[model samples]
Target: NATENGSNLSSEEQARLQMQELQKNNIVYFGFDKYDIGSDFAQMLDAHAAFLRSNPSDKVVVEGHADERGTPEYNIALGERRASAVKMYLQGKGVSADQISIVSYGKEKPAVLGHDEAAFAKNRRAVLVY
Candidate 1:
């Protein structure tokens, strides 16, 4: 019988936990108005790609975001580009195309809410979700 044990989390639950750990260690940040993968984030992306490769059946959503310095339309497109950029990077590292999907939050979801550059900087990022 499948007992209701605390250690019996589903595979999806375990994958989600692993994703959260990865996010804490590997969130990719972007420069203002740019989607280029920065050198600073190269190692993190490498690790992410490695994870995806090892977990072939797992799927991930690349959530793109932007700062509030632009028009909604512009930010939306920018956000899409940011997510696409990460997707391409992962693809180059041998992650399958079908295992990844993307969505752009644009400036609608700021990581930090403030007019200052510090907040703006934090808002511009792409996150991987499983």
Candidate 2:
């Protein structure tokens, strides 16, 4: 065994490194027109929940986004619902509600600039931004 050693890392430095790894997994994808949490995203949610538990002082905004298949009005509400779903998932897993904020960008911000199914799939997502 390598002693699981972190030789040169102070607690703060180690924590920041860990935080960056966690941040890279901030976004979770959803199905077309879907705004529900599922087993598929449970592990991702668990990771975020654990992070929040460890860093109680930290705050995260759940940015909900949608594919551009619909009008802005419906897309906006859809994105809002998706964001709420993500917030609900984390809160349900024991993360504090106060640490979670939500926003809906609808189709205004596209992760990919294409109308293809692949692009649409990538666009429908909720991201945890610190």
Candidate 3:
């Protein structure tokens, strides 16, 4: 146990770096009109479940989003449905209910700005906010 990595590097720094890595994989995608996640997306949820299992006290919010093609009111509900689907998947992965929150931003917050299909695809997603 020699401390020679760097003068400013500490456990705190290492923790922050690990969190950044987690953030990189903190998002999951959904189908065009379906609230269900893909099999590949299930792997993304698994990563988050692992984190919550290890850090029991830490909590995370699942913010659901929707594309720009739906009505504002309807989109909010769709997002809620989407978020719920995501939270349930996390639970299926062994994450406790108390450690996760479900939220829906709907069409209010778009990850990308455009009227094209490409942008719509990016906007239709769910993200983990810890």
Candidate 4:
């Protein structure tokens, strides 16, 4: 049943809707072969962390990814680092440890399918999934 406080959506449903809205801002991107959340993307993370703070019961999976230019193993490690970085940032912003988890897709999942810098830039990112 709907409540005056908000819609009747379940926590997971609310989280999914929040993620969908945030996805439009694009996932956090990294520099070439780098996992640091650069200044350019820090604001995005801040926004995400704030969202999580507002939805304390919601959980998120931060999926790290890499471009197709690296060896599979190397990419996997890099991806994990990326995911961890985002997780740490969120934790620092008051998101509880149990509210966030991480995964690494490495080069297995590319946001774009191509061998160009444009595609690589898009691929090197950490995506938030509810």
Candidate 5:
């Protein structure tokens, strides 16, 4: 919920403000090496979907990423798959396709970079960007 602290503010304004905040901060993180939304990711998406439905003006960008183990081309395909997976999940939640966009970072931009498994695991993720 939202609150107007001054002397004269309408409830509608406060509610809209709160809804804006919710939309602005909406994000969902995915697990490593997996594009399929499992239990944890599903839970996060449930909440995010609810928020997006409440804020119709809000739009989201799904950034698909993958680990460094594969070649660039392979990673790109994987990233696309990841993005598609998320888009499908969102569609299942009744979110309009127009409200969602997807981009594949592939192996170009990594959340963590190293020659080790830990860094690779970190890199394999889908980031929800608003």
Candidate 6:
């Protein structure tokens, strides 16, 4: 799934490239626990949706994450909802449903350290890949 040139690559490799771009552009954000997409996040997603629309051939993976505030199993479920919500929004914004996927990272990857609200806020979010 690795590639040196952009001419040809496997589907996995293409996903990696899109994810890298998503991270670089910060095309992702956080949401409060028990909340769906907020206005702030919607704005970001609108822009991301636009970007993806301009590149319809591209695909994406929506990675949902959660903080350590709940049990692992519960957190995993929450993360799934969060990711699914993102996918729904993107689809509503005209991104092809078939071109997108979702995964729940749960409390696995934390962008910040510590158990405080600040860290939790950063952790509870959906990441747009591609």
Candidate 4, residue 115: Cα displacement in angstroms equals 1.9
Question: Alpha-carbon error at 29 in model 6, in Å?
Answer: 4.2
Candidate that beats the other on TM-score, 2 or 4, i.e. the better one? 2
Q: Candidate 6: lDDT of 26?
A: 48
lDDT of 4 by residue, 20-98 (tens): 7777774888888898888888788888888889888878899999884658999999999999999999999889999
Q: How many residue-pair clashes does candidate 2 contain?
A: 0
Model 3 / residue 42 / CA error / Å: 2.0
Model 3 worst lDDT window (10 residues): 1-10
TM-score of 6: 0.74
What lDDT does the true structure give each of the candidates?
Answer: 0.86, 0.87, 0.81, 0.85, 0.72, 0.76
| CA RMSD of each candidate after superposition | 5.0, 2.6, 4.0, 4.1, 3.9, 5.7
Q: After superposition, how far is residue 106 of candidate 1 from its true place, in Å?
A: 0.4
Indicate the residue-level lDDT of 92 in model 5: 90
Off by over 4 Å in 3: 1-16
TM-score of each: 0.83, 0.88, 0.84, 0.81, 0.76, 0.74
lDDT of 5 by residue, 4-119 (tens): 45235575564455555455534444555567766766777776676667667778788888874657988888888888888888889988888889999898998776888878
Number of clashes in every candidate structure?
0, 0, 0, 0, 0, 0
Rank by lDDT (best first): 2, 1, 4, 3, 6, 5
Off by over 4 Å in 1: 1-20
Give the per-residue Cα lDDT of candidate 2 at 102: 98
Model 3 lDDT per residue over 1-130, tens place? 2333434677556445555668978888877877888888877778778877877777889999998566898788888988898889889888899998998998889999989999989988889988
Compared with the true structure, the alpha-carbon lDDT of candidate 3 equals 0.81
Query: What's the lDDT for candidate 5?
Result: 0.72
User: For model 2, which pairs clash?
Assistant: none
lDDT of each residue in 1-130, candidate 2, tens digit only? 1334455888666556667777877788889989988788899889989888788888889999998576899899999999999999899989999999999999999999876999999999999988
